[PDB]
Amino acid sequence: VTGSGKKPWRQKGTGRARSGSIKSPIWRSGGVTFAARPQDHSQKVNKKMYRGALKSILSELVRQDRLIVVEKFSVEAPKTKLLAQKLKDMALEDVLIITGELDENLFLAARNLHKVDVRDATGIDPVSLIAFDKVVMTADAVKQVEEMLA
Amino acid sequence: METIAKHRHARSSAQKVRLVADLIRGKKVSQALDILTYTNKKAAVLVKKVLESAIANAEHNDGADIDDLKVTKIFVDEGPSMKRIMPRAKGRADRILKRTSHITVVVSDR
């Protein structure tokens, strides 16, 4: 804290409490007894534990029929309107599209759709699977999952 | 009628003015006016001016016939105080409070 180490007043004779510095934490305008510092909150998770949780999550999605497997999922042109129509007739509004190969055409179509996400099998995280109401996996996307999950 | 009238930020202290206020509380305006006229206090002329204003407000903005008016309510409230530094002996300093007050007078014909 900006200031000086000079004692505000003498140790004895003054009728008020002993003080040592203007920057003491019990003083106005300067203090904070335990000041925070920039810290890393990331924690270690074992590889097997990460895989086990991912396997556990996928199984339960299948059990709650929240996971739908279909053939290749693609859009002819990079238009959000087309993607909205394709998801409308399927009665899906909050979906996570997982495809084996990432194509810019599908990536751009879903960019402006908040409730819709497009992802690759490699870039799969537990939070996304849990958060999204429905998960749609392509045939290719499914295959890569077992290979990486093993 | 209400026909209130107040004077805010009077320099006189609330305690000192409050002695004069108690004299005329509940009395008719005619008796209140000459009571203040012959009261030897600074607060007397402050309160009298407020009472004159209240009577004028009733006469102009409200019904006439100010003869039958009475001071139904009168109270003095402490106002903002000005802090001043007054040197004392041995280099010490002390705070002088210039106390103000709000004088409120309410007159009605009933």
Partner: peptide, 17 residues
């Protein structure tokens, strides 16, 4: 509001030994 500056010795120099 503000601490004094002179801070004279208030105690009287008279020890009761």
């Amino acid at each position: 509001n503000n601490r004094p500056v002179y801070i004279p010795r208030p105690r009287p120099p008279h020890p009761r030994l």
